[PDB]
Tab-separated table of C-alpha atoms in Angstrom:
chain	number	residue	atom	x	y	z
A	1	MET	CA	54.972	11.471	39.223
A	2	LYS	CA	56.827	10.411	42.358
A	3	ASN	CA	60.232	11.788	41.272
A	4	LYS	CA	58.857	15.341	41.158
A	5	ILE	CA	58.068	15.235	44.862
A	6	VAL	CA	60.509	15.901	47.659
A	7	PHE	CA	59.517	15.358	51.269
A	8	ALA	CA	60.996	17.404	54.063
A	9	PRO	CA	60.095	15.583	57.270
A	10	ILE	CA	61.081	17.640	60.303
A	11	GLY	CA	61.506	15.981	63.683
A	12	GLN	CA	61.051	12.399	64.841
A	13	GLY	CA	57.383	11.731	63.985
A	14	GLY	CA	57.551	13.229	60.505
A	15	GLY	CA	60.710	11.292	59.786
A	16	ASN	CA	58.999	8.040	60.717
A	17	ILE	CA	56.178	8.852	58.328
A	18	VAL	CA	58.475	9.504	55.385
A	19	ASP	CA	60.749	6.590	56.284
A	20	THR	CA	57.658	4.361	56.241
A	21	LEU	CA	56.515	5.708	52.871
A	22	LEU	CA	59.940	5.107	51.311
A	23	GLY	CA	59.816	1.493	52.552
A	24	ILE	CA	56.672	1.009	50.456
A	25	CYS	CA	58.099	2.866	47.461
A	26	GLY	CA	61.472	4.577	47.138
A	27	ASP	CA	60.635	6.519	44.001
A	28	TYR	CA	60.087	9.632	46.157
A	29	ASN	CA	62.822	12.081	47.172
A	30	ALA	CA	63.387	13.095	50.796
A	31	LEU	CA	65.616	15.228	52.991
A	32	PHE	CA	65.163	14.235	56.616
A	33	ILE	CA	65.669	17.188	58.921
A	34	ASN	CA	66.139	16.907	62.669
A	35	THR	CA	67.774	18.282	65.820
A	36	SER	CA	68.367	14.683	66.955
A	37	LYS	CA	71.261	12.763	65.398
A	38	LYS	CA	70.097	9.508	66.995
A	39	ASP	CA	66.774	9.901	65.148
A	40	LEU	CA	68.452	10.569	61.787
A	41	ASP	CA	70.859	7.678	62.366
A	42	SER	CA	67.976	5.347	63.142
A	43	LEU	CA	66.136	5.992	59.869
A	44	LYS	CA	66.023	2.868	57.678
A	45	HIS	CA	65.622	4.426	54.224
A	46	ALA	CA	67.170	7.880	54.415
A	47	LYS	CA	69.434	8.719	51.472
A	48	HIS	CA	69.688	12.368	52.568
A	49	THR	CA	69.699	13.875	56.058
A	50	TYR	CA	70.330	17.272	57.599
A	51	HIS	CA	71.219	17.513	61.268
A	52	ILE	CA	70.576	20.823	62.982
A	53	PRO	CA	73.521	21.723	65.290
A	54	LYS	CA	59.461	18.042	72.682
A	55	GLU	CA	60.465	21.662	73.434
A	56	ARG	CA	59.505	23.880	70.470
A	57	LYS	CA	61.109	26.933	72.112
A	58	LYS	CA	64.466	25.128	71.971
A	59	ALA	CA	64.010	23.562	68.534
A	60	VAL	CA	63.325	27.054	67.154
A	61	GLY	CA	66.320	28.676	68.888
A	62	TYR	CA	68.874	26.276	67.380
A	63	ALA	CA	67.396	26.315	63.883
A	64	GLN	CA	66.646	30.006	63.271
A	65	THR	CA	70.087	30.858	61.887
A	66	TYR	CA	69.859	27.741	59.690
A	67	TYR	CA	66.435	28.099	58.006
A	68	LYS	CA	68.118	29.260	54.804
A	69	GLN	CA	70.771	26.545	54.819
A	70	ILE	CA	67.980	24.025	55.303
A	71	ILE	CA	65.984	25.375	52.381
A	72	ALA	CA	69.202	25.399	50.322
A	73	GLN	CA	69.855	21.728	51.136
A	74	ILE	CA	66.463	20.866	49.677
A	75	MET	CA	66.981	23.052	46.624
A	76	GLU	CA	70.546	21.957	45.957
A	77	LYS	CA	69.762	18.266	45.696
A	78	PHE	CA	66.124	18.421	44.591
A	79	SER	CA	65.844	21.648	42.588
A	80	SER	CA	64.178	19.643	39.813
A	81	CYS	CA	61.274	18.877	42.204
A	82	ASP	CA	58.171	21.014	41.689
A	83	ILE	CA	56.382	19.783	44.807
A	84	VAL	CA	57.821	20.151	48.298
A	85	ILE	CA	55.952	18.525	51.172
A	86	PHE	CA	56.901	19.176	54.754
A	87	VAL	CA	55.842	16.543	57.247
A	88	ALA	CA	55.577	16.940	61.000
A	89	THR	CA	54.081	15.513	64.150
A	90	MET	CA	52.409	18.673	65.387
A	91	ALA	CA	52.890	17.796	69.036
A	92	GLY	CA	56.666	17.496	68.527
A	93	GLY	CA	59.160	20.187	69.571
A	94	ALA	CA	61.052	20.479	66.277
A	95	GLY	CA	58.085	19.501	64.146
A	96	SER	CA	55.779	22.057	65.701
A	97	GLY	CA	58.353	24.842	66.043
A	98	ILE	CA	60.536	24.608	62.960
A	99	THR	CA	58.143	23.496	60.214
A	100	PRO	CA	55.955	26.616	59.981
A	101	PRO	CA	58.781	29.127	59.563
A	102	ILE	CA	60.693	26.971	57.071
A	103	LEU	CA	57.537	26.345	55.055
A	104	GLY	CA	56.530	30.023	55.194
A	105	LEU	CA	60.046	31.092	54.225
A	106	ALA	CA	60.373	28.563	51.377
A	107	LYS	CA	57.000	29.557	49.930
A	108	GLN	CA	58.178	33.189	49.727
A	109	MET	CA	61.559	32.247	48.246
A	110	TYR	CA	60.208	29.816	45.653
A	111	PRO	CA	56.816	31.192	44.539
A	112	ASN	CA	56.736	28.908	41.469
A	113	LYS	CA	57.025	25.654	43.430
A	114	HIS	CA	54.026	24.003	45.068
A	115	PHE	CA	54.142	23.408	48.817
A	116	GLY	CA	52.274	20.980	50.988
A	117	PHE	CA	52.112	19.990	54.614
A	118	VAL	CA	51.382	16.648	56.227
A	119	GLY	CA	50.594	17.211	59.898
A	120	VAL	CA	49.608	14.709	62.579
A	121	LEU	CA	47.293	15.869	65.367
A	122	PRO	CA	47.917	14.306	68.812
A	123	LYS	CA	45.585	11.828	70.569
A	124	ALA	CA	43.117	13.246	73.116
A	125	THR	CA	45.032	11.404	75.846
A	126	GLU	CA	48.245	13.332	75.239
A	127	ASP	CA	49.028	16.099	77.718
A	128	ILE	CA	48.865	19.901	77.711
A	129	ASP	CA	52.222	20.855	76.161
A	130	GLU	CA	51.556	18.396	73.361
A	131	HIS	CA	48.208	19.971	72.502
A	132	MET	CA	49.672	23.438	72.960
A	133	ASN	CA	52.389	22.661	70.401
A	134	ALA	CA	49.884	21.249	67.922
A	135	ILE	CA	47.639	24.305	68.250
A	136	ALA	CA	50.610	26.685	67.885
A	137	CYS	CA	51.830	24.695	64.923
A	138	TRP	CA	48.471	24.900	63.241
A	139	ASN	CA	48.052	28.600	63.962
A	140	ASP	CA	51.516	29.465	62.651
A	141	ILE	CA	50.866	27.533	59.457
A	142	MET	CA	47.480	29.255	58.994
A	143	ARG	CA	49.006	32.701	59.535
A	144	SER	CA	51.753	32.021	56.947
A	145	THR	CA	49.647	30.399	54.212
A	146	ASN	CA	46.563	32.609	54.116
A	147	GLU	CA	44.610	30.168	56.291
A	148	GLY	CA	45.727	27.240	54.176
A	149	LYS	CA	44.940	28.735	50.760
A	150	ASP	CA	48.603	28.843	49.614
A	151	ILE	CA	49.469	25.201	50.303
A	152	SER	CA	47.935	21.764	50.181
A	153	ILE	CA	47.319	20.176	53.583
A	154	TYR	CA	47.120	16.491	54.546
A	155	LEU	CA	45.864	16.603	58.122
A	156	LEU	CA	46.117	13.310	60.019
A	157	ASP	CA	44.538	12.442	63.369
A	158	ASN	CA	46.243	10.132	65.884
A	159	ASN	CA	42.884	9.693	67.644
A	160	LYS	CA	41.782	7.512	64.716
A	161	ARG	CA	44.094	4.531	65.361
A	162	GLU	CA	45.597	2.737	68.348
A	163	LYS	CA	49.259	3.126	67.365
A	164	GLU	CA	50.985	6.000	65.600
A	165	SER	CA	52.662	3.296	63.523
A	166	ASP	CA	49.226	2.414	62.114
A	167	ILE	CA	48.528	5.999	61.093
A	168	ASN	CA	51.931	6.092	59.410
A	169	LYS	CA	51.599	2.834	57.523
A	170	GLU	CA	48.112	3.646	56.356
A	171	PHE	CA	49.000	7.145	55.192
A	172	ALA	CA	51.944	5.813	53.253
A	173	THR	CA	49.688	3.251	51.595
A	174	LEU	CA	46.948	5.757	50.792
A	175	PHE	CA	49.348	8.320	49.397
A	176	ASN	CA	51.268	5.829	47.295
A	177	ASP	CA	47.986	4.303	46.049
A	178	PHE	CA	46.916	7.834	45.153
A	179	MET	CA	50.100	8.325	43.090
A	180	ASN	CA	49.488	4.959	41.366
A	181	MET	CA	46.103	5.895	39.836
A	182	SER	CA	47.887	6.452	36.523
A	183	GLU	CA	49.041	2.823	36.212
A	184	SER	CA	48.052	1.805	32.672
A	185	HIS	CA	44.644	0.173	32.300
A	186	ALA	CA	41.816	-0.398	29.822
A	187	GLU	CA	40.115	1.744	29.370
A	188	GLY	CA	39.682	4.992	31.306
A	189	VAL	CA	42.454	6.059	33.654
A	190	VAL	CA	43.251	9.053	35.838
A	191	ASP	CA	45.976	10.776	33.775
A	192	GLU	CA	49.356	11.726	35.252
A	193	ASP	CA	48.478	15.367	34.513
A	194	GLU	CA	45.288	14.947	36.524
A	195	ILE	CA	47.244	13.377	39.370
A	196	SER	CA	49.488	16.425	39.146
A	197	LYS	CA	46.422	18.711	39.326
A	198	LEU	CA	45.144	16.876	42.405
A	199	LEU	CA	48.610	17.219	43.993
A	200	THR	CA	48.838	20.941	43.330
A	201	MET	CA	45.332	21.809	44.572
A	202	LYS	CA	45.469	23.995	47.666
A	203	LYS	CA	43.754	23.555	51.020
A	204	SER	CA	42.876	20.175	52.357
A	205	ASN	CA	43.190	16.836	50.718
A	206	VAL	CA	41.623	13.560	51.919
A	207	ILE	CA	42.290	10.070	50.466
A	208	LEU	CA	39.712	7.289	50.931
A	209	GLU	CA	39.699	3.613	50.081
A	210	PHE	CA	36.505	1.564	50.235
A	211	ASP	CA	35.237	-1.997	49.990
A	212	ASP	CA	34.383	-3.361	46.543
A	213	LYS	CA	31.660	-5.343	48.326
A	214	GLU	CA	28.806	-3.471	50.032
A	215	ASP	CA	26.591	-0.604	48.891
A	216	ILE	CA	28.889	2.177	47.695
A	217	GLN	CA	27.345	4.833	49.972
A	218	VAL	CA	27.718	2.502	52.972
A	219	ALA	CA	31.300	1.559	52.100
A	220	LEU	CA	32.366	5.204	51.785
A	221	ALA	CA	30.629	6.121	55.010
A	222	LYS	CA	32.624	3.413	56.805
A	223	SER	CA	35.729	4.707	55.053
A	224	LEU	CA	35.135	8.294	56.240
A	225	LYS	CA	34.240	7.268	59.774
A	226	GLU	CA	37.410	5.170	60.026
A	227	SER	CA	39.521	7.696	58.113
A	228	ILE	CA	43.012	8.488	59.397
A	229	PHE	CA	42.508	12.054	58.115
A	230	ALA	CA	41.117	14.714	60.436
A	231	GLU	CA	37.348	14.916	60.161
A	232	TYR	CA	35.902	17.617	57.890
A	233	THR	CA	32.411	19.091	58.283
A	234	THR	CA	31.951	20.812	54.925
A	235	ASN	CA	30.356	19.234	51.845
A	236	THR	CA	32.336	20.643	48.928
A	237	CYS	CA	35.735	20.008	47.460
A	238	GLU	CA	37.544	21.384	44.442
A	239	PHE	CA	38.919	18.483	42.377
A	240	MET	CA	37.986	14.860	43.017
A	241	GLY	CA	39.852	11.820	41.731
A	242	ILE	CA	38.092	8.476	41.431
A	243	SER	CA	39.727	5.166	40.522
A	244	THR	CA	37.645	2.014	40.939
A	245	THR	CA	37.785	-1.678	40.027
A	246	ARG	CA	34.300	-1.570	38.481
A	247	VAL	CA	31.865	0.969	37.061
A	248	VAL	CA	30.474	2.986	39.959
A	249	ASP	CA	27.815	5.617	40.531
A	250	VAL	CA	29.861	8.810	40.731
A	251	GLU	CA	26.887	10.827	41.981
A	252	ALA	CA	26.613	8.578	45.047
A	253	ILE	CA	30.294	9.076	45.890
A	254	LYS	CA	29.902	12.843	45.710
A	255	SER	CA	26.861	12.387	47.914
A	256	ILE	CA	28.972	10.956	50.715
A	257	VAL	CA	32.358	12.579	50.169
A	258	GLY	CA	31.645	16.101	48.966
A	259	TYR	CA	30.591	17.841	45.766
A	260	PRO	CA	33.574	18.757	43.544
A	261	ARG	CA	33.623	21.382	40.796
A	262	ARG	CA	35.671	18.965	38.720
A	263	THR	CA	36.135	15.202	38.617
A	264	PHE	CA	38.722	12.941	36.992
A	265	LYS	CA	37.515	9.335	36.800
A	266	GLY	CA	39.362	6.153	35.933
A	267	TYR	CA	39.798	2.466	36.649
A	268	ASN	CA	42.425	0.164	38.084
A	269	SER	CA	42.794	-3.539	38.752
A	270	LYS	CA	43.438	-3.338	42.486
A	271	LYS	CA	41.645	-0.838	44.740
A	272	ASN	CA	38.766	1.604	45.046
A	273	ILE	CA	40.073	5.014	45.846
A	274	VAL	CA	38.687	8.529	46.110
A	275	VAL	CA	40.910	11.568	46.427
A	276	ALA	CA	39.152	14.771	47.460
A	277	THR	CA	41.168	18.000	47.248
A	278	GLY	CA	40.484	21.645	48.056
A	279	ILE	CA	38.436	20.839	51.152
A	280	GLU	CA	38.138	23.675	53.646
A	281	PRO	CA	40.904	23.103	56.258
A	282	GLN	CA	39.571	21.190	59.292
A	283	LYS	CA	39.429	24.086	61.781
A	284	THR	CA	36.660	22.502	63.885
A	285	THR	CA	38.544	19.248	64.451
A	286	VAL	CA	41.722	21.155	65.295
A	287	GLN	CA	39.937	23.546	67.634
A	288	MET	CA	38.698	20.632	69.745
A	289	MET	CA	42.224	20.463	71.142
A	290	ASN	CA	41.372	23.692	72.985
A	291	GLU	CA	38.679	21.825	74.893
A	292	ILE	CA	41.255	19.180	75.840
A	293	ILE	CA	43.657	21.848	77.060
A	294	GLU	CA	40.936	23.523	79.135
A	295	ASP	CA	39.978	20.230	80.782
A	296	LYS	CA	43.562	19.158	81.519
A	297	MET	CA	44.244	22.614	82.976
A	298	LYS	CA	41.197	22.262	85.186
A	299	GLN	CA	42.850	19.127	86.578
A	300	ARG	CA	45.776	21.342	87.659
């Protein structure tokens, strides 16, 4: 359920992502966190903000003394929320520098809550500092979460669309569609408890929607190729959720998406959606940024 989730976007990019999601559905909770007051003030749908009194060194310096106040803000207002999802543009100063410590610190302080992370990787065309922030952000998150085993990760890739705004809109749609798989229907449905289980599964999650039209293997292949989520190279996941307008061949979906150890299947009247959770974190895709850094450094 949407009310049991609280988002903690940190920095400009993350805020835009959560602001966009809330514009599609406001049933979620959110505390927007930022060093920039202008950014907070320019949010359209922010009921709760916390201002901290591109440069991650500076973001970090201002926020350090406040990590515990920040965590307390979240827990004061949204202590009834069992799922806390931090959201950051990994190339951003505050997003890259502040999110890992706060997430690492919150996980230790609230061992019974589930934590997740939505991170956006920068386009290949971005410059060195941007990639360096994203890499450092990833590494700090890995180091604090047992290489991604202690949290769920939604890793987005700005290379996959022309405008950031398209990544944002699409993620909001996919995530909200994911949460709507419980919408009553005859007959089979993906239970709310199963949606919960998919939400609380650790490591990497990927959400796919595919065309009701063409061959199901072809449609899912298009969906993966065009996916706004960072590419993954493994072939297994942990729990898979499937909600489709018609009867489908579940073995063919697993064939393209990954082989789960457990599946929850259901139907809905609107879309065809696969949620794959527990995927090994996309180290290979992230590590490509190192090749970008090398090449841009060569230029200098």
